[PDB]
Design a protein around this ligand. Sequence first.
Ligand SMILES: Cc1cc2nc3c(=O)[nH]c(=O)nc-3n(C[C@H](O)[C@H](O)[C@H](O)COP(=O)(O)O)c2cc1C
Ligand code: SF4
Ligand code: SF4
Ligand code: SF4
Ligand code: FES
Ligand code: FES
Ligand SMILES: [Zn+2]
Lengths: 56, 259, 216, 113, 99, 92, 126, 231, 442
Amino acid sequence: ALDNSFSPENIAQVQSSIGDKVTNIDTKALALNHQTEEYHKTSKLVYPIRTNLVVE
Amino acid sequence: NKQIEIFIDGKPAKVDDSYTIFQACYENGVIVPRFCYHERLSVAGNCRMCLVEVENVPKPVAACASQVVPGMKIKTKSEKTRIHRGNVMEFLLANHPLDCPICDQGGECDLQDISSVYGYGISRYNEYKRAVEDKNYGPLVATSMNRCIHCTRCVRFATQIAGVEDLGKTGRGKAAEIGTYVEKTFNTELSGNVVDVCPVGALTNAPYAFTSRPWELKSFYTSDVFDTLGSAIQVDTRGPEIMRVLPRIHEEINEEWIS
Amino acid sequence: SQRGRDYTPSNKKYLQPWELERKEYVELSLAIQSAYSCKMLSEILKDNLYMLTDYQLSFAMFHLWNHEIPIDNYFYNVISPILKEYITRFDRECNKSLAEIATFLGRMNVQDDALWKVIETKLVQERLYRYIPLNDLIDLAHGMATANRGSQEFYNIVENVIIKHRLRLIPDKIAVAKDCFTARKIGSPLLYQVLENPQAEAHELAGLKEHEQLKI
Amino acid sequence: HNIRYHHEIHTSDQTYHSSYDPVGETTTERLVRYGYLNKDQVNNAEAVAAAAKEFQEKEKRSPSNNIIIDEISNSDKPITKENRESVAHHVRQQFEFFREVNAEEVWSVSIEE
Amino acid sequence: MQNKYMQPIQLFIVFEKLNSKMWISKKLNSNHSIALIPSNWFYSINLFLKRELLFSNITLIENSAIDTISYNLETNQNDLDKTNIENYFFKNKMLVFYN
Amino acid sequence: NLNPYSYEALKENHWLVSDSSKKNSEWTHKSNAEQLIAKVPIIYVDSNIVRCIGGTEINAGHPQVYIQLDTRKHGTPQTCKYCGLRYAKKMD
Amino acid sequence: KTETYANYYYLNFRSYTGQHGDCYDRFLIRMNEMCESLNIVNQSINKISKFNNIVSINTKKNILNKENFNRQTTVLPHLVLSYLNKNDYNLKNTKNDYNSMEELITHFKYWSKGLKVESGYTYQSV
Amino acid sequence: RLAAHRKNDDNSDSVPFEFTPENYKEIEKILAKYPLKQKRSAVMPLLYLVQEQNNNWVPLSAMKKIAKLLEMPEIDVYEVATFYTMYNREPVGKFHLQICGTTPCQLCGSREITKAIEEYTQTKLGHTSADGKWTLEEVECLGACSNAPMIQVNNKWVYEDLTTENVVKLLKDLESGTDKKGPQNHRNQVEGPLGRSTLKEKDFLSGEIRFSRDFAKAKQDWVAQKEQERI
Amino acid sequence: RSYGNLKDQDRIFTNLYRDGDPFVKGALKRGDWHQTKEILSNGPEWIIDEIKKSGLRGRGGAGFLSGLKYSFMPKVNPDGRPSYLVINSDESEPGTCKDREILRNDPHKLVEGALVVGFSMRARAAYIYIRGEFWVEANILQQAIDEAYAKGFIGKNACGSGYDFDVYIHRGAGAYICGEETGLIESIEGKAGQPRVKPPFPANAGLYGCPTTVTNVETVAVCPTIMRRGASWFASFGRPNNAGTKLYCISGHVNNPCTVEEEMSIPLRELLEKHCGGVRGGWDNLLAVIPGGSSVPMMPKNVCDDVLMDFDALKAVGSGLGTAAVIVMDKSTDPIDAILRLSKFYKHESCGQCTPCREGTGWIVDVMERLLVGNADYAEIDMLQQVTQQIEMHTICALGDAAAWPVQGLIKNFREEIEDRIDSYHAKHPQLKKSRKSNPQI
Ligand SMILES: Cc1cc2nc3c(=O)[nH]c(=O)nc-3n(C[C@H](O)[C@H](O)[C@H](O)COP(=O)(O)O)c2cc1C
Ligand code: SF4
Ligand code: SF4
Ligand code: SF4
Ligand code: FES
Ligand code: FES
Ligand SMILES: [Zn+2]
């Protein structure tokens, strides 16, 4: 709901008000990422791309 | 003295010696962007959108504030005039709140009209905008001081047209308040003219607030029966429902103001 | 287009894209991008001399580098004079164009003594390298090293700037700069340590205070 | 930070209009149509000269010149029915223009192909 | 417009009775010219175009009418010229354009 | 608590009759979004001017709007003109 | 030349014309058009492709990056526009209607009344 | 600060504001400066008197009374009050300390002096102290740019030559109420330190500076020159 | 010649060092109220001619012809409308203190000058608009005015010459905008000091609708002394078109800040070294010099080495004489900080009557704040220069153009230092992705 420009306690209170427990609402991390311009979270596909079989 | 001769964009034109440059332009069908000068209100240099480049002149001259000089050549279509108008528009757009989707002026705002026509095209002031809280003046005048450009239109109209003295410029710098000093309502039997006088979405019809946009209103010109004068008006409607009414320019009945 | 129009630049030093019709600029860019012969490119540039642009010249150089188009006697005779005139017409707002031209000429191993002298004078005497990005400066140095056409003064200035911009070194640009330096064997122990770890603290890096004592 | 040149200054909006009076219209007929020569006051040398002078001075064009406007090409040679040599020149110009236009094709026209 | 272009004045030369009015603009291509013609010598013009060398190799591309009764210049009214298709349409009631 | 259509109520809720239960709006607007947003608390802000976009990034919410937290009366919160969030002064 | 619209004026493509004007001729025209369209599409894709990369002076191994879309994909759809129209490219990539009031006015006008068009009659064929 | 009247009960309409008889008597001379047709031209003297006699805080009731006296709109009176920075619409501290923050003051070290003063009072520059004795503010160029650094107290008796120890001593004196107005150093008012190179000769300063001129002869010469130019 | 050395013999402001009583006693000791009736008997035409022949240039902002400005006043109003003579003793421009020194040291000379100006313009009334910051100066001036009125030089009978002269002292406020002419007239009328339309001529329509002529305090001060001495005496103290002396006020990073009177066209280096002991740390340590008010752009070291304190010389150097306020900044001052402070002062001084001026001042303040930290680019300098150019000549008064000139001068002079600071900030802070949101609030 709120951007990085918001205060840490206010951000946590807003996250708790909407009953949010899935998104990261840590006050320490919110203070550490104050006014950040990271691109996004990224995943890494690891070669080779093969089907994950359940064989026993 | 009786018929001076000017050159508007290289076109010779015989005009009156007492008329303004904006008067000559409007008479010759030349549309000049403007935001403060009203033909029925006091002439002021509050806006700079009328600053026009004239041949053999050092700086742009407010056409609404500047009269016609004999033999003057006004190059309204010149690149210098275009650059000056763009600079003025960019300066004006510096602190205008991004409220067009949430302002009743959308679709009929002289601000956006000048921006699309006489504007630069893009914005370059990447900083936090100043903000001023709106006022409370009753259910007739809807106040949005954030978009109030301090055009002094409300003050001039109240002092000169309505005659009431409740509007004035408070403060200085970039935080001048376009509103009353104390908290009160504006009840002077011409509150509907305050919304029609604000060049921006600062003053709007609260009963008609968020009703619709001009793109969905059908206007028909008629005459009122509520007052014994029967001043001409235009009623805008949407389908079977009548939306609102606005004054019509009738100098023989009520000029351009209604009760 | 040209009828009732003057192709004279407004700035009297370089013609910006705002002075010409967009259709003409687009057509010139497409023609430059579709020039598959050295003689054809020379003819296109000469014919479009009245409306030529620095961005268009940079794009032509980039296309010549990407397509590996051979530089022939036509390039040495016709392209060289126009390129020299454009370089003499450059300015501080021509940082991207000048850097791209230098990098492309170096990467393509272009052998033009007069053009190289003009480029060196513009880069060093005018000291416009401050408007060249650190990664862009490293790429330009790598290009100059590819043809081995570069001044040792510019190399030292580039090394000092690289030492200055230790926090902005990406791994790819770092590897490119390391190749550029080791290929020409031009560098310092401080530059080599920065190549080993650019974002490292001031303890591991030796001579950092002395290097920072001299600005730029 | 360069917001001055977002709006294009030059656009391909140039328009030219070329006006030519009737080719068969005689110089005396042209003066009569323009009002410089009276319909009845014809075949008089002095009146014809006066009408021609008035047409030349007022309209800034020769009464024997059929080109009113030539903004498309700015040509000066009018084509008149009396001007057989000018008609021949126009025919030659049309043939040369046809040849040049058909010779400017990249893939449309190819004699060798 | 860097190609060879010339007004088809041969139409008025053959007609020898119609005041030719031609217009060329950069809004259309470099080979597009628009001319007003009287309806009286309309079939004659069509036949002359259909059966004349340097013009017989022609094909009708399109044909459309414009209800010039209510076509009115919305904006930039003062910018109208004295040789404008807009003024010509404002003068007449309909305009049939055959390309 | 105060009866609707009163002068005090009109002065308070900008000449409008505020609905406390929010069911009147949930029927008139066909959505309980009014009460859902009313479930939010009041936020105290240190700065006298705030930038609200209804989200986390530009174009990730509503257009940025500047709200003046410093008014004539201390501690008067302001709801966003773009989102349902309301912000107030940190102390006064 | 007087009718080329977007990109055929500078690219080489082969067009086939029939010598009979029959149904088989039309079918052959369609098939050859499909083949030449595939070829022209490949050429156009290559025109916006970065076929060359900086090669190391030491030895000749290409200096391939490790964290670059260029290393991942040889095609750069933004390279030409970024190099030739960097001002417009930056203006578009930086400012938005959610951030620029002028851009907000542009979005409003384009979505409510639309951009005004000058009076005139034109005919464009594709 | 706030261009609109803040919702403070201290400046509410219920505040009792009546001008003193001396202020009423003083109004006789002030009104004579401007024509009777324009009595609003005395609004500046009226506001000055109000600020003098109302603890450097102009009440809204005082503004209303001034508007009643001036026969001018109350909105106009409020606008005139807010347009100027020399008027305080709210109750300020006993010492409205003003420090010049302009470049001429900052070059002489106005920032260090302000920091020392704030350390003395333990109050922010933009706020007022809890004790209610002083209120700091970074004022603009007070006309003492040449004698910078310069401070002022209650818009009168501006002090100059503001050093660290000098400012500490001046603040202690202000607490004691006996401070050397103007510069607290050896500079002779505008004659700054390091000597005096202007008018070092004093005999001519005491020479009665009597310059005579026979204006009738000069006027006759001017008229004769005009006649000659005409001829 | 080699100007810049004027002795005490021809000095008008003899009590500049506060060497005498500013009251009527020291005034008559300083030559005040001497031959005033005879000088007035020459007539308004003769007085105006003498002022013009003295080569008097406007001592305030512009340096325009004071004689021409005074002669532009109407001889007689056909409708009986009065006349007003305004003396602008409200100098809020940073760097200047000459008016502040004059008010507290030479009170009656300005009174005699205002009386002479009113006689020349047939004005029955004069208003000395004294700065609200000059409180004690205003009190001293009021005492001197009362003494002069009791002396018979002003009032119903001004020195017994059959010309009633009334004088008022206006205690203003902190309004550099009211420091202007039209803003001063507006504040005198009892409203906000926003400048009026231009040209509405104040000579054609000034204060209270009556014609009003506004002049600087220093310009009006020399009116009686110059008339007594002769036009040649004040016209042989400077270069052509720059006639008269000037009370240059020098401060900043100088060794001995002060304010002294000297002949016009004084060499910059000579006047700096002789009158103040040079720049603290010598001529080598000096980095910049503003030769006028905050409006005047800062000058470079080479220009300061080779320049003269004249209007034409300053214009040739790109600066302006203006108020002749000599602000000296040494090598230890960050020019960006001074620019930001001047921006804050000017934006707190623009009346905002012009949206262009107000918005430009705010954006320039924001850009100055962002530039010091380095969170900007080289293109930001170009954008700031473009904004400053756009603000110029497009405002109501000269205030909107005043703030842009210092920024333009700083940009033209200190490109390398700003670039180095930006480089340091950027190498100290790398960020590939720039946030699409506006600049973070300061
Ligand atoms: C914002 C602003 C401030 C001004 N401040 C002063 C000032 O302090 N002193 C002054 O003499 N003129 C000042 N002026 C100039 C006046 O408007 C007026 O032109 C001038 O006082 C005329 O005096 P002069 O002809 O002797 O220079 C200022 C102008 C502006 C626009
Ligand atoms: S007044 Fe309203 S509609 Fe007009 S530009 Fe401002 S925010 Fe947009
Ligand atoms: S509120 Fe509106 S009418 Fe009043 S001054 Fe502001 S812009 Fe003008
Ligand atoms: S220039 Fe500035 S101070 Fe002067 S009138 Fe205009 S907005 Fe006000
Ligand atoms: S609208 Fe014309 S000067 Fe203001
Ligand atoms: S800057 Fe210090 S009082 Fe002027
Ligand atoms: Zn929101």
